[PDB]
């Protein structure tokens, strides 16, 4: 049959859905390993591939992006997904591919960008791209990273590390931070990211764990909020996600806490 993340109810998405807000008319770019649009449960409105060796963004050889995309839909079932392939089959990609995909999303007027990806080094050009996307009014969300801890050192990866980005950690169904969730002052909010069931290539479903799974729930969140408040800016979307969270533990580990979309949408 099929499945849906427990995370959809954890972040209070069902309340919005029930009120008729499901992400309709919101464009979300899933910057990742592509999206298998063949999946019966996923509809992909457009996209682009920047992986020179994989020209079809609608084909996902890794499964990473399909799963992620499935999560955004789970949270915002009416959203318009854009498959922006910047990661090849082995799950890896050049920072340049990623920038290119970010640029594409700005140029193509995406409302929200989900980046369930990261690397340990910063790039000014990557910073510039995310910063420009935010200045352009796009809500930019990224996985915080799955680097665990290292003392007092920040383990948030890039781009999640840039203040213009909403870096999302992962919690489990009990709201406990996942051992792998990156930490540091740049962590902004948390979302479910352990054993999240989602779509996989080949009319399949499956579970994955990672801040990459947390991220799409917040990207979906933004989408639901935008569908209720089509004129709010990214600033407003972001602040409301951030200010209505359910406080959990300390900021270093949990950011402002878990997202509560119902509250966020006012
Ligand atoms: Na950040």
Coordinates of C-alpha atoms and ligand atoms in Angstrom, one line a residue:
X1 CA 0.0 0.0 0.0
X2 CA 1.6 3.3 1.2
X3 CA 2.9 5.5 4.0
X4 CA 3.2 9.0 5.4
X5 CA 5.6 10.4 7.9
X6 CA 4.5 10.6 11.4
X7 CA 6.1 13.9 11.1
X8 CA 3.2 15.4 9.3
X9 CA 1.0 15.2 12.4
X10 CA 3.9 16.0 14.7
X11 CA 4.3 19.5 13.1
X12 CA 0.6 20.1 13.1
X13 CA 0.1 20.0 9.4
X14 CA -3.3 18.2 9.5
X15 CA -4.9 21.1 11.2
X16 CA -4.1 23.2 8.1
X17 CA -4.9 20.6 5.8
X18 CA -8.3 20.3 7.4
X19 CA -8.8 24.0 7.0
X20 CA -8.2 23.7 3.3
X21 CA -4.5 24.8 3.3
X22 CA -2.3 22.3 1.5
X23 CA 0.3 24.3 -0.3
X24 CA -1.7 25.0 -3.5
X25 CA -0.1 27.3 -5.9
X26 CA 3.2 27.4 -3.9
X27 CA 6.3 26.5 -6.0
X28 CA 8.9 24.5 -4.0
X29 CA 12.2 23.7 -5.5
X30 CA 13.7 20.4 -4.2
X31 CA 17.4 21.0 -4.8
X32 CA 18.7 17.5 -4.5
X33 CA 19.3 14.2 -6.5
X34 CA 16.4 14.7 -8.8
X35 CA 12.9 13.5 -8.3
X36 CA 11.4 10.4 -9.8
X37 CA 8.2 12.0 -11.3
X38 CA 7.1 8.6 -12.4
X39 CA 5.9 8.0 -8.9
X40 CA 2.2 7.8 -8.9
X41 CA 2.1 9.9 -5.8
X42 CA 4.4 12.6 -6.9
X43 CA 3.7 15.3 -9.4
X44 CA 6.5 17.2 -10.6
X45 CA 5.7 20.5 -12.2
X46 CA 9.1 21.3 -13.7
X47 CA 12.8 21.4 -12.9
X48 CA 16.3 21.2 -14.2
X49 CA 19.4 19.1 -13.9
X50 CA 22.8 20.7 -13.4
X51 CA 24.6 17.3 -13.1
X52 CA 26.4 17.2 -16.3
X53 CA 26.2 13.4 -16.4
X54 CA 22.7 13.1 -15.6
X55 CA 20.6 15.3 -17.8
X56 CA 17.2 14.2 -16.6
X57 CA 16.1 15.8 -13.3
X58 CA 13.1 13.6 -13.5
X59 CA 15.0 10.6 -12.9
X60 CA 16.4 9.9 -9.4
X61 CA 19.1 7.3 -9.3
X62 CA 20.0 7.8 -5.8
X63 CA 16.4 8.0 -4.2
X64 CA 17.5 10.9 -2.0
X65 CA 15.5 13.6 -3.7
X66 CA 12.4 11.5 -4.3
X67 CA 12.1 10.8 -0.6
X68 CA 12.7 14.3 0.2
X69 CA 10.2 15.5 -2.3
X70 CA 7.7 12.9 -1.0
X71 CA 8.0 14.6 2.4
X72 CA 7.4 18.1 1.2
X73 CA 4.2 16.7 -0.5
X74 CA 3.2 14.9 2.6
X75 CA 3.2 18.1 4.5
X76 CA 1.9 20.3 1.6
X77 CA 0.1 17.8 -0.7
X78 CA -0.9 20.5 -3.3
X79 CA 2.4 22.2 -3.7
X80 CA 4.0 22.4 -7.0
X81 CA 7.4 20.6 -6.8
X82 CA 10.4 21.5 -9.0
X83 CA 13.0 18.8 -9.4
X84 CA 16.3 20.6 -9.3
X85 CA 19.0 18.0 -9.7
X86 CA 22.4 19.1 -8.3
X87 CA 23.4 15.8 -6.9
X88 CA 24.5 12.8 -8.9
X89 CA 23.5 9.1 -8.4
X90 CA 26.2 8.7 -5.8
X91 CA 24.4 11.4 -3.7
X92 CA 27.3 13.9 -4.3
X93 CA 27.4 17.3 -6.1
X94 CA 29.6 20.3 -6.9
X95 CA 29.0 23.4 -5.0
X96 CA 28.7 25.0 -8.4
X97 CA 25.8 22.7 -9.4
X98 CA 24.1 23.6 -6.2
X99 CA 24.5 27.4 -6.8
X100 CA 23.3 26.8 -10.3
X101 CA 20.3 25.1 -9.0
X102 CA 19.8 27.9 -6.4
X103 CA 20.0 30.4 -9.2
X104 CA 17.6 28.5 -11.3
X105 CA 15.1 28.6 -8.5
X106 CA 15.4 32.4 -8.1
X107 CA 15.1 32.9 -11.9
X108 CA 12.2 30.7 -12.0
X109 CA 10.5 32.4 -9.2
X110 CA 10.3 29.5 -6.7
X111 CA 8.5 30.4 -3.4
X112 CA 10.5 28.1 -1.4
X113 CA 13.8 26.2 -1.7
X114 CA 14.6 23.0 0.1
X115 CA 18.2 22.0 0.3
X116 CA 18.6 18.6 2.0
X117 CA 22.3 18.8 1.4
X118 CA 25.4 20.2 2.8
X119 CA 29.2 20.3 2.8
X120 CA 31.7 21.3 5.5
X121 CA 33.3 24.3 3.7
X122 CA 31.8 27.6 3.0
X123 CA 31.8 29.3 -0.4
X124 CA 31.1 33.0 -1.0
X125 CA 29.4 32.2 -4.1
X126 CA 27.1 29.7 -2.3
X127 CA 26.5 32.3 0.4
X128 CA 25.8 34.8 -2.3
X129 CA 23.3 32.6 -4.0
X130 CA 21.3 31.8 -0.8
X131 CA 21.5 35.4 0.2
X132 CA 20.3 36.6 -3.2
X133 CA 17.5 34.0 -3.2
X134 CA 16.3 35.4 0.2
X135 CA 16.7 38.9 -1.0
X136 CA 14.5 37.9 -4.0
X137 CA 12.0 36.7 -1.5
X138 CA 12.3 33.0 -1.6
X139 CA 12.1 31.0 1.6
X140 CA 15.3 29.1 1.8
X141 CA 15.5 25.9 4.0
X142 CA 18.3 23.5 4.4
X143 CA 19.3 20.5 6.4
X144 CA 21.4 21.4 9.3
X145 CA 23.7 18.5 8.6
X146 CA 24.2 15.1 10.2
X147 CA 27.6 15.8 11.8
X148 CA 26.8 15.0 15.4
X149 CA 28.8 17.1 17.9
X150 CA 32.4 18.2 18.4
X151 CA 32.6 19.8 21.7
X152 CA 31.6 23.4 21.6
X153 CA 32.2 23.6 17.9
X154 CA 29.4 24.3 15.5
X155 CA 28.7 21.3 13.3
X156 CA 26.2 22.9 11.1
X157 CA 27.2 22.5 7.5
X158 CA 26.8 24.8 4.5
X159 CA 24.5 26.3 3.3
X160 CA 22.5 25.7 6.4
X161 CA 25.2 27.6 8.2
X162 CA 24.3 31.0 6.6
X163 CA 22.1 33.2 8.5
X164 CA 19.9 33.7 5.5
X165 CA 19.1 30.0 5.5
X166 CA 16.7 28.2 7.8
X167 CA 18.8 25.3 9.0
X168 CA 16.7 22.4 10.3
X169 CA 17.9 19.8 12.8
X170 CA 16.0 16.6 13.3
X171 CA 14.1 15.2 16.2
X172 CA 12.4 11.8 16.5
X173 CA 8.8 11.1 17.3
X174 CA 9.4 12.0 21.0
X175 CA 10.9 15.2 20.2
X176 CA 14.4 14.0 21.2
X177 CA 17.2 15.4 19.1
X178 CA 18.7 12.8 16.9
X179 CA 22.2 11.8 17.7
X180 CA 23.4 12.7 14.3
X181 CA 21.8 16.2 14.2
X182 CA 24.3 18.9 13.6
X183 CA 24.5 21.5 16.4
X184 CA 25.7 25.1 16.8
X185 CA 24.2 28.5 17.0
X186 CA 23.2 28.5 13.3
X187 CA 20.6 25.7 14.0
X188 CA 17.3 27.4 13.6
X189 CA 14.5 24.9 14.1
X190 CA 13.9 21.1 14.3
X191 CA 11.6 18.9 12.5
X192 CA 11.0 15.1 12.5
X193 CA 13.9 13.4 10.8
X194 CA 14.3 9.8 12.1
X195 CA 12.8 6.9 10.2
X196 CA 10.7 9.0 8.0
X197 CA 8.7 7.1 5.6
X198 CA 8.5 8.5 2.2
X199 CA 8.3 7.9 -1.5
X200 CA 11.1 6.1 -3.2
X201 CA 11.8 5.5 -6.9
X202 CA 9.8 2.7 -8.5
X203 CA 6.4 3.2 -6.8
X204 CA 8.0 2.4 -3.5
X205 CA 8.2 3.8 -0.1
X206 CA 10.7 3.6 2.6
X207 CA 12.2 5.2 5.6
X208 CA 15.3 7.3 5.8
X209 CA 16.8 9.3 8.7
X210 CA 18.7 12.5 8.5
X211 CA 18.4 16.3 8.8
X212 CA 17.7 15.8 5.0
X213 CA 14.3 14.4 6.2
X214 CA 13.7 17.1 8.7
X215 CA 14.3 19.9 6.2
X216 CA 11.4 19.1 3.8
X217 CA 8.9 19.1 6.6
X218 CA 9.8 22.8 7.2
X219 CA 9.8 23.5 3.4
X220 CA 6.4 21.9 3.3
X221 CA 5.5 24.1 6.3
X222 CA 6.4 27.2 4.6
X223 CA 4.3 26.1 1.7
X224 CA 1.2 25.6 3.8
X225 CA 1.7 29.0 5.4
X226 CA 2.1 30.6 2.0
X227 CA -1.1 28.9 0.7
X228 CA -3.0 30.5 3.5
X229 CA -1.2 33.8 3.3
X230 CA -0.2 34.1 -0.3
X231 CA 1.0 37.7 0.2
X232 CA 3.2 37.2 3.2
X233 CA 6.9 37.6 2.4
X234 CA 9.6 35.0 3.2
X235 CA 10.6 37.2 6.1
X236 CA 7.1 36.8 7.6
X237 CA 7.0 33.1 6.7
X238 CA 10.3 32.6 8.4
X239 CA 9.7 34.6 11.5
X240 CA 6.4 32.8 12.1
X241 CA 8.0 29.4 11.7
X242 CA 10.6 30.5 14.2
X243 CA 8.5 32.3 16.7
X244 CA 5.8 29.7 17.1
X245 CA 7.9 26.6 17.6
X246 CA 7.4 24.2 20.6
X247 CA 10.4 24.9 22.8
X248 CA 12.5 21.8 23.4
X249 CA 15.9 21.8 24.8
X250 CA 18.8 24.2 24.5
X251 CA 19.3 26.3 21.4
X252 CA 22.7 24.8 20.7
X253 CA 21.0 21.4 20.2
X254 CA 17.4 22.3 19.2
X255 CA 17.4 25.8 17.7
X256 CA 14.2 27.5 18.7
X257 CA 12.5 24.0 18.9
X258 CA 10.1 22.1 16.9
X259 CA 8.0 23.8 14.2
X260 CA 4.3 24.1 14.7
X261 CA 2.8 24.9 11.4
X262 CA -0.7 25.3 12.6
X263 CA 0.4 28.0 15.0
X264 CA 2.8 29.5 12.4
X265 CA 0.1 30.1 9.9
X266 CA -1.8 32.2 12.4
Ligands
LIG1 NA1 21.2 29.3 9.4

